[PDB]
């Protein structure tokens, strides 16, 4: 359950960053930023597919 | 069971030790054999990490389970004279 877990069970797992030898390329895209990118592209392609049908 | 509130048992075999998902109820359930009557019943360890304290052939106290396998009636309360939640909270060591 939720009372059968310690605080070390609850402890957050940190996110790694972009390596410092590669920081000029921008931020390291993880699942959240990838979800934002994919949502924007699927939305724009949905509008373009409806415009091509019309 | 019987006429008592808690029964004792021998842990015959931790069934579902090779189950995949961690907090599965098949992972948590343990086949024990009651001492007084002799029958093999199944009981829930309360937690998957708490399963590791239950070893084979250990005297186990078990009570009712009052609220994924609906119908397994018992839960393991004490193992070898020490309370299982105390073992899980790391209050006591298990005398073997």
């Amino acid at each position: 359950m939720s009372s059968l877990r310690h605080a070390i069970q609850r402890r957050a797992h940190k996110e790694r960053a972009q390596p410092l030898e590669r920081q000029r390329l921008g931020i390291l895209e993880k699942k959240k930023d990838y979800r934002l990118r994919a949502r924007d592209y699927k939305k724009k392609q949905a509008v373009l597919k409806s415009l091509r049908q019309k | 069971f019987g006429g008592s509130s808690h029964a004792k048992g021998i842990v015959l075999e931790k069934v579902g030790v090779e189950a995949k998902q961690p907090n599965s109820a098949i992972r948590k359930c343990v086949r024990v054999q009651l001492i007084k009557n002799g029958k093999k019943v199944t009981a829930f360890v309360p937690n998957d990490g708490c399963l590791n304290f239950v070893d084979e052939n250990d005297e186990v106290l078990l009570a009712g389970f009052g609220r994924d396998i609906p119908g397994v009636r018992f839960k393991v309360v004490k193992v070898s004279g020490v309370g299982l939640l105390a073992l899980w909270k790391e209050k006591k060591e298990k005398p073997r």
Binding site: - | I26, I69, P70, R73
Partner: protein, 46 residues
């Protein structure tokens, strides 16, 4: 060759695991529910 062998082994292993644990969970639920319904019948008669 290693692709075909590993995919065959993965299919056979996953099918065997699914079959075995469906049998185990069904037998455990069957026995425990049978004893629970027998105890509820013997308790409701009191």
């Amino acid at each position: 060759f290693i692709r075909r062998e590993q995919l065959r082994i993965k299919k056979e292993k996953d099918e065997a695991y699914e079959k075995k644990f469906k049998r185990i969970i069904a037998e455990i639920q069957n026995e425990e529910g049978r004893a629970a319904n027998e105890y509820a019948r013997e308790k409701a008669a009191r």
